[PDB]
């Protein structure tokens, strides 16, 4: 079909940051979470 028919991007509702893959974001949320 197309090289990028659907270019879904993961956005962070914490710092309004976008990523390439899901994990990329999930891992980032680490710095967002508190009470480590
Ligand atoms: Zn964030």
How would you describe what is shown here?
May be involved in transcriptional regulation. Overexpression causes down-regulation of a number of genes involved in the immune response. Some genes are also up-regulated. It is found in: Nucleus; Cytoplasm, Cytosol. This is Zinc finger protein ZFAT. This protein is α+β, with helices and mostly antiparallel strands and 36 residues long. Strand 1 and strand 2 form a beta hairpin. The termini are far apart. The radius of gyration is 13 Å and the shape is elongated. 31% of the residues lie in helices and 11% in strands. The site of zinc ion (ZN) has 6 residues, from helix 1.
Question: Which terms summarize this structure?
Answer:
36 residues, 2 strands, two-stranded antiparallel sheet, 11% strand, binds zinc ion, alpha+beta
- Give me the strand/helix succession: EEH
Give a list of the ligands. zinc ion
Largest sheet: 2 strands, antiparallel
Please report which band the strand proportion falls in: under 5%, 5-15%, 15-25%, 25-35%, 35-45% or over 45%: 5-15%
Number of H- or I-type helical stretches: 1
Bulk shape = elongated
Distance between the termini: 45 Å
Count of individual beta strands: 2
Please give the share of residues in helix: 25-40%
Going across the biggest sheet, name each strand in turn: 1-2
Quick synopsis:
This protein has one helix and two strands.
What's the layout of helices and strands?
Blueprint: E1 10-11, E2 18-19, H1 22-32
The protein binds zinc ion.
